[PDB]
């Protein structure tokens, strides 16, 4: 199962050639393409539940597309070739290539509501989370558990007009903020890894990114909590007549409930978790993380690829 | 004089409490204050040549202020408490706290003109620059002298409307661009250090920032070329009235001329060279670089600061 | 087939509990057992070509034993549970757990003779070796082809009475020696990897160890040359009776000939390549290398093993 | 005061040229020589209390030799150009170049007894140490504090016939052992640093090395305890009529009692704390640690020295 790392390795190597060239679609589509090629060489029966979208506007890794050898139990397949293609195109930090796999039918439905509100923290402080409490009370309880003062805390938040109130409320408590322009899968995993410089992720981001992060959290530990975030009353009603209680707090296991979860990622640009891909004459080096829920084993994998063998 | 790193460590630690708090002046002010206190306890006599500004719009580290306990040969002093207070106040990457020292009277005057066109590269390509040439020609010349493909080169550039043509021209060359929103001292240093991922810095930034980057380039090797870049005709005459040859190409040694040059910097937020201030139960870590032109020795310094108490908190691991 | 790294991780973790406990056979036995269990759950069909020994003096991983769940193309299997049980049992540096796999019938027979004279180097100097020449000549040839000074070269050598002349000759050359007390699979790999600090391995060690080192060198690049080294006339005829040309120079591909070669290793104690097993409240870390000749891809793998429970212990940081 | 790192940098660079050349005295004396040259360029008034020995058999850094500029308060100077010159000469790991400085008269007398029995552990478990208890009880109490099982513990012990009983007793408890052929300054500092792989140092080693280690422990935290270890009844009587209670447990502050302690070290060969010196065409890189008791600041310093500037 470790062999699934070659999928994000291939995605990151493809996107790595487009880093800093200012073409979002070029790099994104090249990563999609390398990953779809490599996943269909892998001994698995998978169905894309999270990918590039519906087949009418996404030719590759559309929702429902079957992937893999064809061998093995059919399972849920979530893929994010680049978590924030703009970071890749501008040469910014913390762009990652991501993939998760769970038991079929155990990944929360990514299409119910576009956005969800999120909070995430690592294993030491996971027990104190309450996304219905004000962010200030989450910060103080998390800080006390970590033996930090509140002014030592660092909260990762997407830089968005919608987060003006949240940003104001975090600042009022005294904690530092790490504003990111994109990439709250990376932000969420960083909140849960030790000595990353990020102690907490908060705010609204993509529902599919919330499920991908939960897959990671299932394997490495920590918690994410979420609540669906209808944009308008239309999506609010669509959600209610799909069956959802909007007072409902989703825990990690509500987003990904399988017993067999797999997650891996490979760095595209340098981030606070993974170094970006580096190209050399002889080849190139990728930096990846790989993890499984059943063992709880976490692997850091640095790979030196030899494409050719020069004079 | 490794002790001067404590100036940037103090400035970074002070600014660390303001990261992401959306108050650029609070953070600068905190950094300014901490650096001034620490600099007046070191055994240098210095005059602030590059600082906050002039005696009236800047209450601390103003141009001309004396710094240091009192003893030592009088020397030129340059400090940038945060290179890009906005990276600090939003919690974005590559904010650093910067200090440079050089022999007295050896630093280019930073009030000549506000802005300066720049191009900087590391030692491998240091004799190949021509800032009067178009960027395409510079990229090609630097690529060939490093036996690299143009499509493999990365240019660091400030993301500004004034750089629409420069950015287009780098891209049409086939080179890559790392777009920064602020911080071309850090970008200049990143270009000059060998295995950084950045081959080149180009574009118009602040004149004081250009001179500080020159001090670092003096110690670590490489070159920067620059020209003054007046913003309108009033400034062009303001400069010309002062005797400036607005066609002169300024080199590294034009900006900082002495043979005793010192540079150090400390990470405020995480960057491509220095990690930012990291907080722990017992204290914090800072990540600094210290450089000296006389010897050419470069030092990467990682420090744990106990805030405070002698083993009442667990031990912390580094790097 | 990255899954095979779990074989050496299991062997290292088992041996980890015996480090410094002064019981070489307990540690080997623990490692042997753990590797056999884990290897029989992977999807290979293999025959043990290099293992503990013959069916009667070795109860587990004996020569000829079949391994793997049952499916897969039959292939050659080499395992060294600890390369130097004595480094393990005293808690000294550079103990590793080793596995190699190659196409069936492609591994040199390890019972031909117990010992083998060896010299190994990385890809830069791979065509310059001559094991029939004196070491002085080899050191000089390797130095020149890497544009290095002889006085800068480092030779890894087993500390043995039988190596008094070899050691003297390296020293008189002006080269350096890293003296190891055991472990010339690790020494061979250290010589072959580029920026390791070791330029060369030389001397007589075990024949099975030479073949395992060849499998790694097949994947990562470089060369080993060897000759069989009988310990007395009885063994010389024992070899010669078997059809061995005791004057043949064996190369890398003589020892391991297939085109599908796999090698992986895991640190038991801390070494110049792999960290040893490290223990934590929630579990342990292992440090492995995995290599494949077909693609030439080299993987450094750091793993945290939860022993056990899902977030009941603090998070651990790596590398 | 950080400028004192250049003394161990110079010692390690000098010894670094002799690494792996099989000449103990060559490398040792070259390190002594580089360090004595560089210390006399430093603004300090110092007197060698720990060095190469008495002046009749040690020309440089003998006991009582005055070192430094001559400027500043006179202080205690302890130096160990290489902690185990055999490691340097054979190309073995964990050879370090070491220097400590304290207030004059505050370093315990290195010449009273040749050997002392030692135990050392880091800041988290320092409070449980009792060198008069059996080693097994120290191991279990240290393990419990660290939240480790006893089989997770690793004890550093000098490989010596005198330690046969200790080695047997540690093995009987179930803990692992890291046997070192030389260098229990390095062993002691490693026991006190986190994530070094060593959790405890135990056994008898040189009294001067015990005082140098205590200097380090004064700055970084942890504890060392010691008891003098007379070889014979002669040294036992010499110690008694010098005034020493041999039932006395020496704590860290009994070995180095100043309020102003400084300690630094530079790696000679690669160790579990510091990388060894690496030589390049342009120059060389040293790896050092520097620490002060009054602030408790610990610095890791990687230096890239440019001796020349080639074609
Ligand atoms: O850009 P939006 O619409 O605010 O949505 C945020 C989402 O976009 C991304 O930044 C990139 O697609 C995700 O990481 C994040 O969840
Ligand atoms: O922000 P401006 O006015 O375009 O000028 C750029 C200057 O500002 C900074 O980004 C920070 O003040 C400097 O690094 C740079 O020299
Ligand atoms: O110990 P001997 O008999 O000299 O042979 C050396 C062999 O022993 C080992 O050191 C460990 O058994 C091997 O690495 C090496 O091949
Ligand atoms: O070699 P001995 O006499 O047992 O003494 C041990 C001492 O020798 C050293 O290994 C090197 O001088 C010290 O680290 C240690 O304290
Ligand atoms: Mg995304
Ligand atoms: Mg600035
Ligand atoms: Mg560079
Ligand atoms: Mg062996
Ligand atoms: Mg090598
Ligand atoms: Mg010593």
Residue numbers in the entry:
A (entry chain B), D (entry chain B): 0 to 310
B (entry chain A), C (entry chain A): 0 to 318
Q: What does the study report here?
A:
Mtb fructose-1,6-bisphosphatase (MtFBPaseII), the enzyme encoded by the glpX gene, is the third component of the glpFKX operon involved in the growth of Mtb using glycerol as the sole carbon source. MtFBPaseII catalyzes the only unidirectional step in the gluconeogenesis pathway of the pathogen. MtFBPaseII comprises the only FBPase activity in Mtb and is closely related to the class II FBPase from Escherichia coli. The MtFBPaseII monomer is a compact, globular protein with two distinct α/β-type domains (I and II) arranged in an alternating multilayer fashion to form an α/β/α/β/α-fold five-layer sandwich.
In addition, we present structures of F6P-bound forms for two variants of the active-site residue Thr84: an inactive (T84A) variant (2.3 Å resolution) and a partially active (T84S) variant (2.2 Å resolution), the enzymatic properties of which have been described previously. The two variant MtFBPaseII structures differ with an r.m.s.d. of 0.265 Å; the r.m.s.d. between each variant and the apo structure is less than 0.4 Å. In the two variant MtFBPaseII–F6P complexes (T84A and T84S) the C-terminus is ordered (although with high B factors), with a malonate molecule from the medium found bound in the center of the tetramer at the interface of two monomers, occupying a position near the location of the AMP allosteric site in the Synechocystis enzyme. The F6P-bound structures contain one magnesium ion in a position that is proposed to bind FBP, coordinate the 1-phosphate and stabilize the transition state. This magnesium ion is coordinated to Asp79 OD2, Glu208 OE2, Asp82 OD1, F6P O1 and glycerol. In the T84S mutant, the O7 atom of the carboxylate group of malonate is 1.1 Å (0.8 Å in the T84A mutant) from the O3′ atom of the ribose moiety of AMP.
